[PDB]
Amino acid sequence: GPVIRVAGDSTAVGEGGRWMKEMVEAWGKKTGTRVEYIDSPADTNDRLALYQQYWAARSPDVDVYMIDVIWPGIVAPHALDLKPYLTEAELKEFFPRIVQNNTIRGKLTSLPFFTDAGILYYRKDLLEKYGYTSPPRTWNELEQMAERVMEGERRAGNRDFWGFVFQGKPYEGLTCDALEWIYSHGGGRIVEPDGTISVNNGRAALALNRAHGWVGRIAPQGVTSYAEEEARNVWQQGNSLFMRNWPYAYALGQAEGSPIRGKFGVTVLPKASADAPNAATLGGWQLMVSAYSRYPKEAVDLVKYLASYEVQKDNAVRLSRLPTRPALYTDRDVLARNPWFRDLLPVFQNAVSRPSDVAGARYNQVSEAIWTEVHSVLTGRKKGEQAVRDLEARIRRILRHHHH
Numbered sequence: 001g002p003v004i005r006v007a008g009d010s011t012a013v014g015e016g017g018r019w020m021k022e023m024v025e026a027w028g029k030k031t032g033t034r035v036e037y038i039d040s041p042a043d044t045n046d047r048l049a050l051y052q053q054y055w056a057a058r059s060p061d062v063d064v065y066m067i068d069v070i071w072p073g074i075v076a077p078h079a080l081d082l083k084p085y086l087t088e089a090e091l092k093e094f095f096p097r098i099v100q101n102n103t104i105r106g107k108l109t110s111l112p113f114f115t116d117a118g119i120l121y122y123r124k125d126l127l128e129k130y131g132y133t134s135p136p137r138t139w140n141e142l143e144q145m146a147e148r149v150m151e152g153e154r155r156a157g158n159r160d161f162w163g164f165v166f167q168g169k170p171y172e173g174l175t176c177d178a179l180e181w182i183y184s185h186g187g188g189r190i191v192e193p194d195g196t197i198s199v200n201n202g203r204a205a206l207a208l209n210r211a212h213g214w215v216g217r218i219a220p221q222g223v224t225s226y227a228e229e230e231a232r233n234v235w236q237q238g239n240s241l242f243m244r245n246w247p248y249a250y251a252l253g254q255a256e257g258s259p260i261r262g263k264f265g266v267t268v269l270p271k272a273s274a275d276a277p278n279a280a281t282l283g284g285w286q287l288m289v290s291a292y293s294r295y296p297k298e299a300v301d302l303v304k305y306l307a308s309y310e311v312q313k314d315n316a317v318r319l320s321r322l323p324t325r326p327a328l329y330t331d332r333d334v335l336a337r338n339p340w341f342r343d344l345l346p347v348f349q350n351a352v353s354r355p356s357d358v359a360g361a362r363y364n365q366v367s368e369a370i371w372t373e374v375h376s377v378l379t380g381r382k383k384g385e386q387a388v389r390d391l392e393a394r395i396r397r398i399l400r401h402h403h404h
């Protein structure tokens with residue numbers, strides 16, 4: 001009978017690919033259906049390019065794709081409309097914001113699978129050691145704490161010790177980190193939901209200059225090549241006071257044999273001042289049935305299973321990834337394992353989106369402009385003032401004649 005083939009997540013990032021393959025194999029065993037897992041590269045933008053090869057070919061060789069929150073507007077032609085397959089009551093079990101994000105010109109492109117938001121990981125043991133009682137609320141405080149803890153840990157002999165790690169590589173992950181910097185300085189959303197390209201302002205420029213000032217000082221020089229896992233590995237080995245990353249890093253840091261198990265907490269990222277908005281970039285992944293799948297019925301069944309209460313529960317408990325079902329945030333087992341899901345729920349609800357709705361199918365070009373200009377500041381090639389002006393000009397060219 002049919003073989004249902006899935007491309008989603010990556011064995012190169014944490015446990016997500018291994019866990020995805022496991023969930024797909026469980027469905028195949030439960031239903032008596034043959035399945036195959038196709039692995040993907042680590043970085044989202046690399047996955048998009050890979051999957052676009054299949055889509056350009058109208059290839060039947062993948063039935064189900066795990067797609068990024070930033071993609072519906074790009075991938076919609078390649079998605080089977082799921083709306084007719086779900087009742088209104090079934091669809092209401094997901095966060096409406098994400099269902100809306102995944103709905104493009106009426107087509108429900110994909111089911112919400114897990115959500116995501118950028119957060120601050122902090123070493124609680126080190127804060128205590130150096131006399132700090134709370135994680136930093138401002139970027140200035142983050143810098144001051146990192147300098148002091150770094151000075152002390154270096155003097156005690158840890159050559160590998162840094163104050164802060166984050167994603168500074170030129171790829172989509174840096175657009176995520178940079179939105180957070182800019183928004184948390186009161187510099188706006190780069191491109192506003194109304195279409196206004198707002199990034200050429202002094203607050204955005206200051207945000208980028210500040211981030212440059214970390215490189216080689218409180219963050220490793222090599223941070224400009226770090227994606228999620230490079231940051232996580234310095235952190236997880238016990239070599240960074242602070243890290244910006246997503247929820248998945250938490251369960252991995254708590255695993256038996258982690259050097260940092262029991263030594264960290266999480267909180268909202270810091271911001272420029274008390275009246276700036278909190279910034280947590282919205283992430284998350286969705287489950288799409290290919291428009292080119294020969295087996296839409298079986299594929300939809302697998303997608304419903306993956307997005308079900310019990311599979312999302314397993315994702316939350318074992319992988320610390322955020323459900324897209326509000327009911328799971330009150331589940332006793334979810335919360336006992338990850339209490340911070342409750343503490344940070346308002347951070348997740350107020351997460352700031354990248355400009356994927358307003359850029360639509362041009363989002364990947366916009367993001368590439370953003371990450372390359374931001375990177376030029378991190379590498380010291382340009383100051384923030386020049387980079388935001390240049391970025392404005394680039395985005396204006398990219399979105400000229402685009403209406404939303």
Ligand SMILES: OC[C@H]1O[C@@](CO)(O[C@H]2O[C@H](CO)[C@@H](O)[C@H](O)[C@H]2O)[C@@H](O)[C@@H]1O
Nearest residue numbers: 009010044116172173228246248283284
């Ligand atoms: O494969 C899922 C896995 O990818 C991550 C990053 O490792 O996804 C987040 O980061 C991306 C940028 O690098 C965002 O585009 C995406 O929206 C966001 O979810 C993990 O957090 C996630 O478990």
